[PDB]
Design a binder for these strands. Structure first.
Lengths: 91, 98
DNA sequence: AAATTTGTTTGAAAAATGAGCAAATTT
DNA sequence: AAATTTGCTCATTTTTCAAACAAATTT
């Protein structure tokens, strides 16, 4: 029912799937705890950065560096794709 | 002084190692495995909307978690994410969060 | 009773789109 | 030699933005 998941082991030594979103939720549950008052200026860019990099890296591994199949696979414009690659300096 | 914390280490998750020890690893790596897994299962089939799929799985808990933190305040939340207050409100309606 | 936030509108700036093309590169 | 992708434009559509400002709610 839910296509993006990650692997998990319990004390009885059994492996089992759970959603990526539960990890994102943990990460952040953790970010906030380890802050006290200190404000946060721009978290939407931060998390986006942390998620766009391993997406781009993984599809360019998969499409063998084919920028055109990549873009089509993601549903974004071929120019958009170049631009984001430039943002992260992987080209 | 203060020890250096790279950005890869600002958002992390609990993992268990080959010596059965508990330990923190980047969210980055959770996102890799998720997709690495997604592909193996895909097996030959095609896609046309992977950006929107990943974007969704990630926007939804980021939004959820931030509103709990500002006890529902949409002005501070949008300020603390650093996005327009009307894009936030737009974005929330998309996921049914109101 | 203040001060702050929500629910709207409006118009301008920035980003994303599709379509074109010659030169380079893979098939 | 032919087919396909790159690198670079243009210009139009869509999304994001800040600045209004009543009316509603929280301090």
């Amino acid at each position: 029912s839910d296509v993006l998941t990650v692997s998990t082991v319990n004390s009885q030594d059994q492996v089992t799937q759970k959603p990526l979103r539960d990890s994102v939720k943990q990460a952040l549950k953790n970010y906030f705890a380890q802050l006290n008052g200190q404000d946060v200026n721009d978290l939407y860019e931060l998390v986006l950065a942390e998620v766009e990099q391993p997406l781009l890296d993984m599809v360019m591994q998969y499409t063998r560096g084919n920028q055109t199949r990549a873009a089509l696979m993601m549903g974004i414009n071929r120019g958009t794709l170049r631009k984001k690659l430039k943002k992260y300096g992987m080209n």
